[PDB]
Design a protein around this ligand. Structure first.
Ligand SMILES: C[NH+](C)c1cc(NC(=O)CNC(C)(C)C)c(O)c2c1C[C@H]1C[C@H]3[C@H]([NH+](C)C)C(O)=C(C(N)=O)C(=O)[C@@]3(O)C(O)=C1C2=O
Ligand SMILES: [Mg+2]
Ligand SMILES: [Mg+2]
Ligand SMILES: [Mg+2]
Ligand SMILES: [Mg+2]
Ligand SMILES: [Zn+2]
Lengths: 217, 126, 132
RNA sequence: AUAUACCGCCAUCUUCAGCAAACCCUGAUGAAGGCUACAAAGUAAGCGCAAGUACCCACGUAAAGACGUUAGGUCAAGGUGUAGCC
């Protein structure tokens, strides 16, 4: 009968009202639409790009809004069902922000040099009975040589769903929920951290509410 | 077990096929969330490729009508000492003043561009 | 290369005891001696026949407690009290053990003509210091 | 008789630093390969150097120096397979 605290959110669409945390104006002022140049583009990001202004590409914010809805819904549902959400980035200007965001929530953050086999040779590297993360959220999909991160391939190899902010120079290919958006501006990255932190915290408090209600019932 | 073939399909397709066969006995935590709210595109591997012949990107260049006059303004009356702010929404630069006044007269009813330009030039001079 | 008392490295599956593991350059730096007889000091006469009897004892007790001596013996020699302290395993029956103790206990007394005493020390399995 | 069957005990590179179980990734899942600390797939038990010991110091000298190389040296130190003599 606990299949009502693990099946109910899954028939309510937007069970966590995550649709009231972001608007195409909030994103526009966070400067999410600003992308890279036509010379740093990706063929697979071409379907998400509104167009090019002065050889500087811009991302379609309606598509960003729909993708961000789906992403934040998924993140809220995994945080409710008590997964492990690992936030991965290689920025160096936002490492402090991502680790502090994980610690203000209760999820985890890899912001440092990804050692080979972290998710793949995981039992040998950590211990025989380790729980690998049930959702990896990349705030920046590229590494510091401007190439896709090992984790995006190894998360897929290990069948861990991935939510990721894909900019113009990124490969939205092996990312389950791509969110077309700027990740080079402090306001944009701050808004992403704020949105994901709020989703995860609201999800965990709602999980506690339904467990309390069913325990009293 | 699991399928570490990241290239054949998606994590959803691989996991669904393996739990149908009966080798993944427990379903993962994320499978029902995927089956409830799937993404707009299943994450299947696609190899990037270089366009070679007469293949061009579908991305267009953003050009509005005001830019015909914007380009003309900078040409004659260059960028003034009134500097752009950019940090504040609703910033109305001097060139924006010019295009708004010019577009005003246009709506009112004028015809040749040079006459339009001199009239809005005296208008901003006032 | 030096090949004196050095058990070479196999593949990491070779049980080996402290004694066998240490090489001859650790002979009293880490190991010590398996036979404590006084003849090898500065002034004494009979050290040669002590060693001739020493190798005899090692091989007699090796063939008389067949396949139960875990590691090698400690042939100490104070007064006329030769001692054959042992580390013998726990597989054969205790009546057989006490028998070979008595048999040796008297036979080396009548071979060497002095008190000879065996103080066995039973151990479950042959010990492993490291796997080489 | 065969060191070209060997144990044993050594020479030599070595007045070296490598040899590596077990995994993982890359190469369209080929022989193979796995580097960037403002970091791009490598993680590593074990042996070796190192460390600790001997001599007068922490210096120097000793000892030590793996995996393998050279069918390198010895059936004559001893033991010994194979073939032989009685
Ligand atoms: C004729 N060659 C092919 C040969 C044959 C045998 N043994 C046999 O084939 C005999 N086999 C039978 C007994 C019939 C079963 C051999 O046994 C040998 C050798 C080569 C020698 C060469 C030696 C030589 N030494 C004496 C100065 C030399 O130049 C070196 C060296 N590295 O300095 C050697 O390698 C040598 O010493 C050597 O090992 C040989 C043989 O052992
Ligand atoms: Mg030497
Ligand atoms: Mg030397
Ligand atoms: Mg040393
Ligand atoms: Mg030869
Ligand atoms: Zn970027």
């Amino acid at each position: 009968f606990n299949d009502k605290i693990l099946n109910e959110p899954l028939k309510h669409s937007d069970f966590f009202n995550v649709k009231e945390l972001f608007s195409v104006r909030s994103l526009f002022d966070a400067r999410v639409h600003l992308g890279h140049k036509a010379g740093c583009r990706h063929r697979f990001m071409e379907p998400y790009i509104f167009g090019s202004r002065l050889d500087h590409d811009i991302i379609d914010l309606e598509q960003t809004a729909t993708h961000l809805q789906l992403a934040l819904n998924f993140t809220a549902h995994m945080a409710y069902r008590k997964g492990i959400i690992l936030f991965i980035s290689r920025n160096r200007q936002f490492s402090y922000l991502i680790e502090n965001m994980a610690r203000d929530c209760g999820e985890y953050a890899h912001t440092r040099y990804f050692r080979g086999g972290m998710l793949t040779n995981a039992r040998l590297l950590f211990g025989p009975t380790v729980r690998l993360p049930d959702l990896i959220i990349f705030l920046h999909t590229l590494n510091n040589i401007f190439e896709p991160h090992v984790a995006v391939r190894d998360a897929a190899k290990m069948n861990i769903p991935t939510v990721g902010i894909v900019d113009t120079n990124c490969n939205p290919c092996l990312i389950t929920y791509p969110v077309p958006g700027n990740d080079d501006s402090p306001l944009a990255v701050h808004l992403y951290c704020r949105l994901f932190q709020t989703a995860i915290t609201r999800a965990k408090e709602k999980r506690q509410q339904v467990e309390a209600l069913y325990r009293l019932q | 077990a699991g399928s570490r073939l990241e290239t054949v399909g998606s994590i959803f397709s691989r996991t669904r096929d393996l739990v149908r066969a009966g080798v993944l006995k427990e379903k993962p935590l994320w499978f029902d969330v995927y089956d409830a709210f799937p993404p707009l595109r299943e994450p299947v591997f696609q190899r990037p490729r270089v366009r070679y012949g007469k293949a061009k990107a579908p991305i267009q260049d953003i050009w509005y009508h005001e830019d015909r006059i914007r380009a003309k303004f900078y040409s004659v009356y260059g960028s003034g000492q009134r500097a752009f702010d950019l940090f504040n929404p609703n910033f109305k630069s001097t060139c924006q003043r010019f295009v708004e006044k010019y577009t005003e007269l246009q709506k009112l009813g004028e015809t040749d561009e040079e006459k339009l330009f001199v009239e809005t030039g005296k208008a901003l001079l006032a | 290369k030096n090949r004196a008392a050095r058990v070479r490295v196999s593949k990491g599956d070779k049980p080996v005891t402290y004694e066998e593991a240490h090489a001859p350059h650790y002979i009293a730096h880490r190991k010590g001696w398996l036979s404590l007889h006084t003849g090898n000091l500065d002034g004494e006469d009979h050290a040669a026949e002590r060693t001739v009897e020493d190798v005899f004892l090692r091989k007699f007790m090796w063939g008389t407690f067949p396949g139960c001596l875990a590691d090698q013996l400690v042939l100490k020699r104070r007064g006329n009290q030769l001692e054959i302290c042992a580390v013998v395993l726990r597989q054969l029956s205790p009546h057989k053990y006490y028998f070979l103790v008595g048999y040796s206990e008297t036979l080396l007394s009548y071979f060497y003509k002095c008190p000879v005493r065996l103080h066995l020390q039973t151990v479950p399995s042959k010990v492993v210091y490291k796997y080489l």
